[PDB]
């Protein structure tokens, strides 16, 4: 390695040393509330005084902020300099900062947060050391004036090179640019850990989720043509989806629904992936809005299926799970609405499931076929197994009525199924 | 068979014949030994510049290679030869017609396994002896004890124990006493690959149906199970750079890396080696570095490097994908035509039945390159049947002319 | 006699003691804020430096763990997590078009004769 490259490492290590006067002004001039000239004039005691008041306002809105008064916003913290703190003391310092940014993620719109974070920027130089976490918390405030101020005083990591254009620029970053940063596969894995950090702690908030859902949806859109890129998007965005489904929050579960739906249309997947998608969707399905979104999501996933078994019956565990979370009356209401989405493949699979498992539900089968027109091959499959039912299962008024329904509609094809089968 | 005018010198363009390569360190220089038919070649990991070659060709093809500091042990038919800088110093001859397959050298014990499930133990005559020569004892594993021997492995901190791995299961034999000290439980799937992990008492096992097992000997129990359905493991290796990464090679030609701490897939390398020629025959991480060496039966030896993470924090998360560092390769089939490129005799043009024209260096650099087939504007081409070259006009215009099979025109090339 | 709690608070302010801060900082947890083989030979064998084999193995055991730090995985040993399982099993997620009877919308597999 060249001495200059090695020396660049030395400079990065001693970025916040403040060894000379000139270095001190650059570190101290950085501010989120005030300009450079005034920032050089404001003192740690003055900054701490404003920050301490700001946290008290932050404490009232959310009690969790009060904890950091014991640790970060303490009167002693004025005398703490990270440059003199040993190696083990820094991570614990890093950990306490990292959690505070998680709290501030949802309250950046509030003015007191900016004053409170000023103490961190000035005292602990989070913009220099914890540069990735501060930006990564403030991705969804990109149009907000705060994010512009953050860009000016912060040195972008290599992964955020796309935002170098908007550093100290009058236009804010545009809707299109975050897609490029979010396109990069290294960042998506970087962002993933942070989303995994929030979900374990239930830090996901709507304004965060909304930004994220659009972005993954767009990244699938941005890579729709490029097939192999979509393939390597599968390991990352789905395991995000699996986590959001694991969350008890209804908002997280629906956020998983939208990403799964769009990708399946963008990319056809194996059935085992589709069938497994249900069991995570249905396992933690409790919310009223989530089940409405889940049911629509479930129907779309079959519409993507275009291989043999497209309309085959659901497995026992999947079928039992579905009827529990969606009783037969609900799907009858689902099929009743005129604006119902195309779900013929699901119902064909569902109806065949009813026959193999539930004998009592056959009379409900008659209702489903009337409500929704099934495709001709799909009707052929439904006739095929029902012939097997007559041979095996006892003749029933509902069972014979099901044929009589087929006798009324397209009589000639009922003979083909009988001719091909007995 | 011996000429009074000529004598064999070496082989050009062949880096590996498919036998797994052995790696070692000489001081600060790491070396890789690769089998080439009846001869072997040692390459420097820093530059893939050849260092030594065998002085003579073995009477029979070499089956397995083991490298230990300045000594490399090569086995052919029923004889195991000990070589130094490619020079034969002492030859080990087994007393049975059965040919050797698997070799393990730990301490002063040299262990050789024959096709008849017989393991021969040799020991140093003197504690300061450089290589085992003396015949200690013979240990044979019967069908009741276990199946065919897959490989001979020795775990660290084991006093005179040989961790014999068979298709049926693993067996622990004490070479000093020649007794079966422990038998592991039978495994449903056939074992194909065995690799000692950097951890202790844990040896990785690769099965025929895409299963990697972290079998802990000490507990005599399974610790973990990686699943790669519809795949066959051909090689295994661990990263010793401080990152808990395991490289899984497959006969399909795919090399997969797992973050065994995170229970996640870091990346997959696709079609690095041809599936028709056995895919990834051997893939070994270099001891204490982010460099992994991979080889195959397609006559190609390749290097990958793990770039340090681009993220200041959570570097373990953001792992850079593996990258092409350097490689040596050649024809995948026997050459059809050969000619001398320059009067100075430093580069050779060579054509084979793989539809490729290659240039091989004859010096210690071992440089090799495939002439590009990208066409000028005004699959590979069919097989070269004839070729002529001149050097009166190098650098001014085309000087090579080639004829192809079942082709009504000839193409030109520029050296 | 030991100092009183009131005295400790005053002592902390004057001497600039920050240990209480670091301990709270270290205690900071984000969740709160929100014999298979037995070989007789090994026991009897005596190895010159003379030490018993088992004790020698333990020291050679202890020597190795200095050479290489132990990683954490060796310590480690409907259903919601089905998605995570299937993604781990396969690195191929494209449904094979050989089974599909409907040709791809955008990609046409065509070869000249």
């Amino acid at each position: 390695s060249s001495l200059s490259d090695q020396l660049a490492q030395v400079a990065s290590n001693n970025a916040t040393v403040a060894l000379d006067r000139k270095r001190r002004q650059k570190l101290h001039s950085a501010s989120l509330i005030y300009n450079s000239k005034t920032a050089a004039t404001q003192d740690y005691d003055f900054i701490f005084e404003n920050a301490s008041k700001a946290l008290e306002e932050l404490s009232q809105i959310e009690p969790k902020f009060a904890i950091f008064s014991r640790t970060l916003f303490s009167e002693s913290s004025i005398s703490l300099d990270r440059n003199v703190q040993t190696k083990e003391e820094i991570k614990d310092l890093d950990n306490a900062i990292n959690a505070y940014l998680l709290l501030a993620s949802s309250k950046w719109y509030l003015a007191p947060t900016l004053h409170a974070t000023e103490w961190l920027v000035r005292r602990f130089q989070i913009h220099v050391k914890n540069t990735e976490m501060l930006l990564l918390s403030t991705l969804n405030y990109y149009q907000t004036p705060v994010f512009k101020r953050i860009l000016s005083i912060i040195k972008l990591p290599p992964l955020f090179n796309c935002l170098s254009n908007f550093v100290r620029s009058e236009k804010p970053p545009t809707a299109l640019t975050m897609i490029k940063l979010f396109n990069d596969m290294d960042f998506l894995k970087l962002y993933t850990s942070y989303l995994d950090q929030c979900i374990k702690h239930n830090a996901t908030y709507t304004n965060q989720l909304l930004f994220t859902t659009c972005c993954f949806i767009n990244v699938v859109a941005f890579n729709s043509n490029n097939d192999e890129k979509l393939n390597q998007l599968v390991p990352i965005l789905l395991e995000i989806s699996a986590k959001l489904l694991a969350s008890k929050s209804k908002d997280c579960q629906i956020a998983a629904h939208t990403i799964l739906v769009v990708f399946a249309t963008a990319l056809p997947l194996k059935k085992t992936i589709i069938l497994a998608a249900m069991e995570t969707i249905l396992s933690n399905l409790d919310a009223k809005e989530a089940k409405h979104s889940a049911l629509l999501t479930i129907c779309k996933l079959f519409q993507t299926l275009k291989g043999q078994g497209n309309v085959d019956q659901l497995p026992s565990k999947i079928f039992k799970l579905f009827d529990s979370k969606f009783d037969t009356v609900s799907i009858l209401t689902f099929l009743d609405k005129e604006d119902k989405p195309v779900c013929d493949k699901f119902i064909t699979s569902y109806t065949r499931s009813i026959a193999r498992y539930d004998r009592s539900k056959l009379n409900i089968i008659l209702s489903l076929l009337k409500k929704i027109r099934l495709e001709r091959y799909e009707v052929r499959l439904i006739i095929t197994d029902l012939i097997y039912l007559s041979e095996i299962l006892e003749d029933k008024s509902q069972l014979v009525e099901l044929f009589e329904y087929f006798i009324s509609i397209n009589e000639d094809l009922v003979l083909k199924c009988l001719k091909s089968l007995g | 068979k011996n000429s009074k005018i000529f004598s064999p010198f070496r082989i050009i363009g062949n880096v590996s014949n498919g036998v797994p390569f052995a790696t070692g360190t000489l001081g600060s220089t790491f070396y890789i030994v690769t089998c080439v038919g009846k001869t072997f070649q040692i390459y420097d990991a820093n530059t893939l510049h050849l260092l030594f070659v065998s002085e003579k060709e073995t009477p029979s093809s070499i089956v397995a290679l083991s490298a230990h500091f300045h000594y490399v042990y090569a086995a052919y038919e029923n004889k195991v030869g000990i070589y130094k800088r490619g020079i034969e110093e002492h030859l080990l001859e087994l007393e049975t017609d059965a040919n050797v397959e698997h070799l393990c050298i730990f301490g002063d014990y040299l262990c050789a396994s024959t096709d008849d499930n017989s393991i021969f133990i040799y020991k140093k005559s003197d504690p300061q002896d450089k290589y085992p020569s003396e015949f200690y004892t013979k240990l044979t594993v019967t069908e009741i004890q276990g199946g065919e021997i897959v490989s001979l492995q020795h775990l660290a901190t084991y006093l005179n124990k040989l961790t014999v791995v068979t298709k049926s299961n693993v067996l622990l034999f004490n070479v000093r006493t020649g007794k079966l000290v422990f038998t592991s439980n039978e495994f449903p799937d056939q074992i194909t690959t065995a690799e000692p992990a950097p951890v202790l008492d844990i040896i990785a096992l690769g099965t025929v149906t895409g299963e990697v097992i972290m079998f802990n000997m000490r507990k005599g129990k399974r610790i973990r199970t990686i699943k790669i359905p519809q795949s066959r493991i051909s090689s295994l290796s661990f990263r010793t750079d401080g990152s808990s990464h395991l490289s899984v090679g497959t006969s399909s030609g795919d090399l997969i890396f797992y973050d065994l701490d995170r229970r996640s897939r870091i990346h997959v390398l696709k079609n690095i080696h041809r599936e028709s020629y056995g895919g990834v025959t051997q893939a070994t991480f270099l001891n204490g570095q982010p460099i992994i060496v991979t080889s195959g039966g397609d006559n190609s030896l390749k290097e990958y490097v793990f770039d340090p993470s681009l993220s200041q924090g959570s570097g373990d998360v953001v792992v850079q994908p593996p990258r092409y560092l350097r490689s040596r390769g050649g024809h995948s089939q026997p050459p059809s035509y050969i000619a001398f490129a320059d009067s100075q005799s430093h580069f050779m043009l060579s054509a084979s039945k793989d539809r490729s024209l290659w240039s091989f260096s004859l010096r210690k650099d071992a440089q090799s390159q495939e002439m590009s087939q990208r066409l000028h504007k005004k699959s590979k081409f069919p097989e070269i049947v004839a070729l002529a070259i001149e050097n009166a006009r190098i650098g001014e215009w085309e000087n090579i002319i080639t004829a192809h099979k079942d082709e009504k025109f000839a193409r030109t090339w520029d050296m | 006699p030991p100092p009183d709690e009131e005295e400790q608070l005053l002592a902390k302010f004057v001497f600039g003691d920050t240990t209480d801060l670091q301990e709270n900082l270290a205690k900071f947890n984000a969740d709160f804020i929100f014999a298979a083989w037995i070989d007789s030979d090994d026991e009897k064998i005596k190895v010159p430096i003379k030490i018993n084999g088992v004790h020698y193995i333990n020291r050679l055991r202890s020597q190795f763990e200095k050479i290489y730090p132990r990683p954490k995985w060796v310590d480690d040993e409907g259903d919601i997590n089905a998605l995570t399982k299937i993604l781990s099993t396969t690195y191929n997620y494209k449904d094979t078009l050989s089974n599909s009877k409907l040709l791809p919308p955008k990609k046409l597999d065509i070869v000249r004769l």
Binding site: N165 | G107, T240 | -
Partner: peptide, 24 residues
């Protein structure tokens, strides 16, 4: 701007390895 990914260069470093003579 595109995300800069630098090749730089890799030089190996000697590392301590366990000796099998102690095992024997």
């Amino acid at each position: 701007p595109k995300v800069v990914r630098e090749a730089k260069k890799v030089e190996m470093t000697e590392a301590r390895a366990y000796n099998a003579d102690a095992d024997t």
